[PDB]
């Protein structure tokens, strides 16, 4: 992995502290604006829905791709959702329940198999990824996503494929994006939260893996988690 | 399958002779503008890339979802096809030569077997292994397309779940958190004024926790009318509240 400090320009205009990791073809060819931060580990927040969904399917907690999660202070948490819907929209109770049913022993087992961050799930079985001790780096997110892309995670190919379709966020004949956002909450200047955007882009016959994170201490800065990576990817010729 | 005559309103303007079949939840609850035409069989054209892809994967002709179909640098009928393509790309751009080669490698015996398993139209593959779905004797109706697509959606085709899932992602054409469309077009040609070609749009829509299966075909003798294969069904679906 090489460092491209010229990418810092994109963070500076907004006084944002963050990192972008971009890899062409495989994780053996990565570039980042900040080597140090690229390997620093942060709360995954909702990016954890990816491993959580795979584990849910593997353990049988989630029956199949067509399972409907029925609603028994947020409007979104009062509607019926498909697996894809639960992943792509706010659905805190759904994944809290999935995590509880999976249980700490099984959860720990799968995060070991997945080499997922610091593999520290202390903090409560239904919130370790948001308020607990779990941390993962941008580099580790790219490695994890690459394994998923290739169906190399320790899970059935079927379940990996199911979760992959659930992650599709942009579609054109020769351009397909699988992605997932995360946000731990708006923190303060001295104690910021973290915001993420991770995924991969298939452009023609090439593939690019990416992971972005930034410190967030202002609610209005949240959209930068998509615009900063987009501008960098544009400059690399991926978007056009 | 009841008939919705009000839907003809979308066909009258362009003097289009066609049919739209729309099913909510399953093929046991369908509606159409034309009962007679709904079960009439036509050349699948480009919609055949769906079963062709599944069969290619099943027989091992296509290795897996990441197989690249390399361009040899030789002229193709469409400039859009003169490049390396993934399986999804080849389907989405309707790269005929890629699928003709797949069909050749599959072979008549295996092709026949799989179309029987899939209950695919008249199952007649006469006319040449690389042209039966384009210029040959293969025929399928709008109702049959919906039945076939429902099976695919449910992973009920006689093929691995893995392979059905691969082709499903390849068919995604519209994506939003609570709205997902899988679809494929077809266009046999303009034929003649007396014997016109056929245009298709088939697929399914997932909106919130509901699913809608659809199949559209129309007679076409002028290429300029092609976009109607998507606009007519879209207008009907939008009128039914099926929109993102």
Among chain A residues, the shortest Cα distance to B182 is held by: A171
The phi and psi torsions of B85 (rounded to 5 degrees) equal -135, 145
Query: Distance between CA B23 and CA B32 in Å, rounded?
Result: 9
Task: Decide: A151 and A158 in contact? Cβ < 8 Å.
Answer: no
Query: Distance between CA B44 and CA B141 in Å, rounded?
Result: 8
B227 touches chain A (CB under 8 A): no
Residue-by-residue DSSP string for B178-223: TEEEEEEEEE-----SSS-EEEEEEEEEEETTEEEEEEEEEEES-G
Query: Distance between CA B90 and CA B95 in Å, rounded?
Result: 5
A72 touches chain B (CB under 8 A): no
B152 touches chain A (CB under 8 A): no
Residue-by-residue DSSP string for B134-160: TTSS--EEHHHHHHHHHHHHTT-SSS-
Bridge partners, A210 (sequence order): A22, A199
Task: Decide: A107 and A133 in contact? Cβ < 8 Å.
Answer: no
CA B72-B77-B80 angle, to 5 degrees, is: 75
Question: Closest Cα of chain B to A201: distance in Å?
Answer: 13
Give the domain ranges of chain A. 1-240
The residue assigned the tokens 């979308």 is B10
CA distances from A120 to A115, A127, A132, A134 (A): 11, 12, 8, 5
Task: Decide: A154 and A142 in contact? Cβ < 8 Å.
Answer: no
Task: Decide: B162 and A157 in contact? Cβ < 8 Å.
Answer: yes
Residue-by-residue DSSP string for A165-228: HHTEEEEETTEEEEEEEEE-----SSS-EEEEEEEEEEETTEEEEEEEEEEE--GGGTTHHHHH
Query: Distance between CA A128 and CA A116 in Å, rounded?
Result: 13
Pairing type for strands B85-86 and B140-141 reads: unpaired
Residue positions of A annotated with a catalytic role = 46
The residue assigned the tokens 């944002």 is A16
- Which of A163, A201, A205 to mutate to test binding with chain B, by most B CBs within 10 Å of its CB? A205
Among chain B residues, the shortest Cα distance to A168 is held by: B175
Query: Distance between CA B118 and CA B11 in Å, rounded?
Result: 31
B89 touches chain A (CB under 8 A): yes
Query: Distance between CA B108 and CA B56 in Å, rounded?
Result: 13
Query: Distance between CA A50 and CA B151 in Å, rounded?
Result: 27
Task: Decide: A103 and A89 in contact? Cβ < 8 Å.
Answer: no
**Nearest Cα to Cα of residue A82 among B51, B211, B232:** B211
Per CATH, the homologous superfamily of domain B1-244 is DD-peptidase/beta-lactamase superfamily (3.40.710.10)
Query: Distance between CA B19 and CA B39 in Å, rounded?
Result: 10
**Protein fold of A1-240:** Beta-lactamase (3.40.710)
Task: Decide: A164 and B169 in contact? Cβ < 8 Å.
Answer: yes
List, in order, residues 6 or more apart from B240 with CB less than 8 Å away: B22
- Six-digit token string for B85: 């393509």
User: Which residues of B fall within a CB distance of 8 Å from A202?
Assistant: 86, 88
- Six-digit token string for A200: 């991969």
Technique of determination: X-ray
């Amino acid at each position: 992995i090489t460092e491209n400090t010229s990418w810092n320009k994109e963070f500076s205009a907004e006084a944002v502290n963050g990192v972008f990791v971009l890899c062409k073809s495989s994780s053996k060819s990565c570039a980042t604006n900040d080597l140090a931060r690229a390997s620093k580990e942060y709360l995954p927040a909702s990016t954890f829905k990816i491993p959580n969904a795979i584990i849910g399917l593997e353990t049988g907690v989630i029956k199949n791709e067509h399972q409907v999660f029925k609603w028994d202070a947020m409007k979104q948490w009062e509607r019926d959702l498909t697996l894809r819907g639960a992943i792509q929209v706010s659905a805190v109770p759904v994944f809290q329940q999935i995590a509880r049913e999976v249980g700490e022993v099984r959860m720990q087992k799968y995060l070991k198999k997945f080499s997922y961050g610091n593999q520290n799930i202390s903090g409560g079985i239904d919130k370790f990824w948001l308020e607990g001790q779990l941390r993962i780096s941008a580099v580790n997110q790219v490695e994890f996503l690459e394994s998923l892309y290739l169906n190399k995670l320790s899970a059935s190919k079927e379940n990996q494929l199911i979760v992959k379709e659930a992650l599709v966020t942009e579609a054109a004949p020769e351009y397909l994006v699988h992605s997932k956002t995360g946000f731990s909450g708006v923190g303060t200047e001295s104690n910021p939260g973290v915001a993420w955007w991770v995924g991969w882009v298939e452009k023609e016959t090439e593939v690019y893996f990416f992971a972005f994170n930034m410190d967030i201490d202002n609610e209005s800065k949240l959209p930068l988690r998509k615009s900063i990576p987009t501008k960098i990817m544009e400059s690399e010729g991926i978007i056009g």
